[PDB]
């Protein structure tokens with residue numbers, strides 16, 4: 117409304133535009149492996165304060181909305197002082213994997229994934245992404261007190277330039293453990309050495325990109341003393357619960373759009389600009405092949421450029437050697453010049469025709485036929501630039517259609533203009 | 539031998555030449571209708587002196603050479619004081635036609651026909667020519683005392699410009715009649731008003747031309763008184779006799795030869811020069827059609843001119859309009875230029891080729907192909923004068939086979955030379 121076009125300058129010149137930052141999980145329906153309440157079943161909160169165990173107990177009943185704890189409560193608006201949470205099934209045996217999967221449907225770039233717990237935090241969990249609509253999954257971040265044993269990872273691996281795309285493991289989640297309200301937050305870029313100029317890092321750009329997100333919990337904080345780790349069987353306090361799940365980032369458009377939006381088929385997609393196309397504006401638009409696709413940046417917008425064919429070609433092709441040689445200015449090449457033109461830009465007239473000046477090069481019929489005079493000219497093909505036909509001695513005119521001054525017209529087809537003698 | 543070429547200058551330049559003047563009848567065998575001596579038979583000379591008739595009589599015997607009087611004696615060398623003469627049969631009735639026919643076999647121009655009589659001269663005779671080898675005959679001159687009656691001609695008709703080709707009749711032969719040694723002489727040109735510049739009179743030129751010559755005698759000078767013209771029957775003095783017949787002129791060559799001469803088949807013909815041909819040098823030689831045939835004159839030789847085709851044509855054609863327009867200099871036109879040349883003189887290179895300078899225009903291969911570079915040039919056909927092909931941007935060379943300074947070679951066939959940018 118009162119927002120001017122972000123994809124272009126105040127002079128109409130292109131500039132980079134990126135969709136707004138969002139929690140991309142807000143309002144979304146998250147898929148989970150486990151939820152309490154079917155069949156209804158009692159659970160207990162355990163309480164630590166002093167040296168006393170208040171085992172407070174309530175009923176998870178999925179058919180009772182006052183007592184239901186559905187995945188929906190993960191991405192509803194979170195009001196503290198009145199929290200809602202999803203809560204897993206109870207009595208979790210070990211080993212296990214209680215998964216939450218957020219499917220975005222469209223590549224985003226993600227700056228963080230975060231959760232607020234109603235229960236205590238897991239001893240162990242992981243976060244994973246899919247960059248391909250959920251056919252494959254890839255570790256994003258690990259949390260655990262036995263990184264090695266549980267996930268086979270070094271604890272707290274330093275991140276090198278050599279692999280800053282590396283999913284590390286840590287126990288930082290354990291620092292100062294409350295049993296409620298526990299926050300975990302994975303910033304995709306914390307501690308990655310190229311973070312400072314993300315804009316020019318393609319490796320981080322890949323790292324942070326995903327279409328879906330999975331968090332899996334695989335071990336509960338052991339309580340009840342666990343003096344005998346013998347107690348394999350579980351209890352009604354053996355569940356996870358979460359009040360809010362967020363995935364912070366923005367829609368992936370390579371700096372060539374100001375928003376994503378819902379098409380026909382209800383699918384999210386970039387509103388591509390800069391004469392770009394594809395769901396992420398990952399490629400140039402037709403006939404806009406003057407130079408290579410580039411992702412925009414702070415300084416350069418890198419719009420896709422229309423190749424020039426002076427209105428004599430439908431299609432266009434990019435040629436890198438030409439680009440290279442031009443000093444990376446232009447490499448487009450026209451195909452099937454159409455109005456008896458020829459050349460790279462359909463910018464000159466095929467032999468057999470010539471350049472009708474006073475009409476401009478863009479003009480349908482900027483190329484005129486050689487209509488060389490049968491008897492006055494010495495051949496059929498005229499000068500493509502100038503129109504001039506090859507004239508016999510004594511002849512003039514563009515088409516050789518006249519004797520010159522000093523000459524007299526014969527009725528010989530071979531020699532039609534003879535010089536006045538003296 | 540010690541005679542330099544008469545048909546050319548002392549600088550080798552053409553000049554008019556004409557065969558020598560001859561009596562063309564000398565030595566020739568003349569055909570006659572009547573000769574005495576078969577069978578042998580007595581004849582009489584009648585003699586006038588005082589008032590006495592010496593009827594001297596001798597025998598014409600054709601088998602006796604001391605007494606034979608054959609046509610041969612008409613053109614044998616005449617020695618006066620020892621004359622020889624042919625003599626007709628005797629007893630000539632009236633009317634009659636005793637004819638002598640000289641066949642030259644070749645057109646001559648004739649300045650006179652002359653005869654010396656042994657008998658008295660005829661009262662009436664005529665001379666005729668053939669301009670066509672004796673198929674037709676045409677009056678040349680008439681002699682008679684009754685021009686009107688005998689030849690149906692006005693006596694002594696004045697000659698007008700209006701017909702100076704007119705055969706007149708006269709009685710001049712009768713002036714001071716001896717009975718022996720009588721001379722008659724017809725000069726073809728006496729009294730013809732154009733005679734003075736014959737050289738430029740085509741009508742006299744035609745008048746004097748012939749191939750054969752006939753003299754016919756048709757009435758004898760009446761003697762014996764002829765008091766009674768009743769005497770129809772004739773007598774042994776009623777014959778003609780002639781010692782010498784001459785036909786003065788020269789062989790017809792239109793000023794383009796210094797002699798006639800006897801070819802294969804024994805026929806007389808001009809030794810034509812000035813690049814002329816035909817029995818009278820009446821036409822130009824092959825490939826020598828630059829200008830029209832002309833008869834030579836005192837000032838201008840009017841040689842036939844070779845047309846110029848710079849050694850690229852076998853045949854040649856004359857064109858009068860071109861001649862006219864050139865100011866009557868030249869009108870020749872070459873046919874089937876042969877080494878990929880074209881034009882009037884095969885003097886320029888067909889489209890598809892061009893003029894290889896440093897080789898001369900006469901050179902087989904003075905025309906070189908356009909070998910325009912497939913990728914460097916913008917079309918196949920090059921400049922016929924210069925060789926230059928139509929070059930793409932950045933290309934140079936006659937064949938467009940190189941990038942210019944400032945340009946770099948691509949491996950695109952469309953645009954093979956790109957400018958170094960700045």
Ligand SMILES: *[C@@H]1O[C@H](CO)[C@@H](O[C@@H]2O[C@H](CO)[C@@H](O[C@@H]3O[C@H](CO[C@H]4O[C@H](CO)[C@@H](O)[C@H](O)[C@@H]4O)[C@@H](O)[C@H](O[C@H]4O[C@H](CO)[C@@H](O)[C@H](O)[C@@H]4O)[C@@H]3O)[C@H](O)[C@H]2NC(C)=O)[C@H](O)[C@H]1NC(C)=O
Pocket residue numbers: 156177178179180
């Ligand atoms: C988890 O939470 C759910 C939701 O509260 C609880 O499930 C029960 O849900 C049913 C809903 O049907 C509630 O049943 C109620 O009690 C009646 C007792 O019997 C009388 O019913 C009819 C009244 O309509 C009389 O005509 C008849 O004479 C009986 O004496 C039920 O029968 C009623 O159900 C009625 O609902 C259906 C449609 O659902 C109608 O078509 C029928 O007519 C039917 O009568 C009535 O709704 C029940 O109260 C809920 N239980 C509660 C609140 O305790 C589970 O109980 C809860 N689970 C646990 C373990 O807490």
Ligand SMILES: *[C@@H]1O[C@H](CO)[C@@H](O[C@@H]2O[C@H](CO)[C@@H](O[C@@H]3O[C@H](CO[C@H]4O[C@H](CO)[C@@H](O)[C@H](O)[C@@H]4O)[C@@H](O)[C@H](O[C@H]4O[C@H](CO)[C@@H](O)[C@H](O)[C@@H]4O)[C@@H]3O)[C@H](O)[C@H]2NC(C)=O)[C@H](O)[C@H]1NC(C)=O
Pocket residue numbers: 578599600601602
């Ligand atoms: C017009 O002019 C001609 C030419 O003079 C005259 O014709 C005569 O021509 C013949 C030529 O043969 C002359 O004849 C001569 O007189 C001979 C007389 O008879 C004797 O002949 C042979 C000699 O060879 C004897 O053996 C024999 O016993 C005879 O007694 C002729 O016979 C001769 O002719 C011989 O010639 C031929 C070839 O021609 C031979 O093969 C024969 O053997 C043959 O004998 C001999 O030549 C004759 O003299 C001529 N007459 C003359 C001079 O008066 C005409 O007379 C003349 N006409 C007129 C009217 O005047």
Ligand SMILES: *[C@@H]1O[C@H](CO)[C@@H](O[C@@H]2O[C@H](CO)[C@@H](O)[C@H](O)[C@H]2NC(C)=O)[C@H](O)[C@H]1NC(C)=O
Pocket residue numbers: 212213214215252253332
């Ligand atoms: C817990 O359940 C999830 C959801 O099905 C399992 O997902 C697999 O996870 C492994 C390891 O990350 C991947 O290699 C597979 O691609 C996932 N499969 C599917 C179908 O999504 C996960 O394996 C389970 N946990 C354990 C320990 O087995």
Ligand SMILES: *[C@@H]1O[C@H](CO)[C@@H](O[C@@H]2O[C@H](CO)[C@@H](O)[C@H](O)[C@H]2NC(C)=O)[C@H](O)[C@H]1NC(C)=O
Pocket residue numbers: 634635636637674675754
């Ligand atoms: C005398 O004889 C000559 C020779 O045959 C005749 O020639 C003809 O002459 C006439 C008149 O000149 C021509 O028209 C003919 O062409 C000639 N004919 C031939 C065959 O040559 C001539 O006619 C004779 N004289 C007379 C009076 O008849």
Ligand SMILES: *[C@@H]1O[C@H](CO)[C@@H](O)[C@H](O)[C@H]1NC(C)=O
Pocket residue numbers: 197198
């Ligand atoms: C939020 O408001 C009150 C605060 O006391 C709470 O008890 C109630 O259950 C909540 N209402 C909702 C979530 O609709």
Ligand SMILES: *[C@@H]1O[C@H](CO)[C@@H](O)[C@H](O)[C@H]1NC(C)=O
Pocket residue numbers: 619620
């Ligand atoms: C010519 O010479 C003499 C001269 O007296 C003459 O009588 C003779 O017949 C002639 N001889 C010839 C024509 O052979």
Ligand SMILES: [Ca+2]
Pocket residue numbers: 189190191192193194199200201358359360
């Ligand atoms: Ca909530």
Ligand SMILES: [Ca+2]
Pocket residue numbers: 611612613614615616621622623780781782
């Ligand atoms: Ca003689």
Ligand SMILES: [Cl-]
Pocket residue numbers: 402403404430431432433
């Ligand atoms: Cl295109």
Ligand SMILES: [Cl-]
Pocket residue numbers: 824825826852853854855
């Ligand atoms: Cl020729």
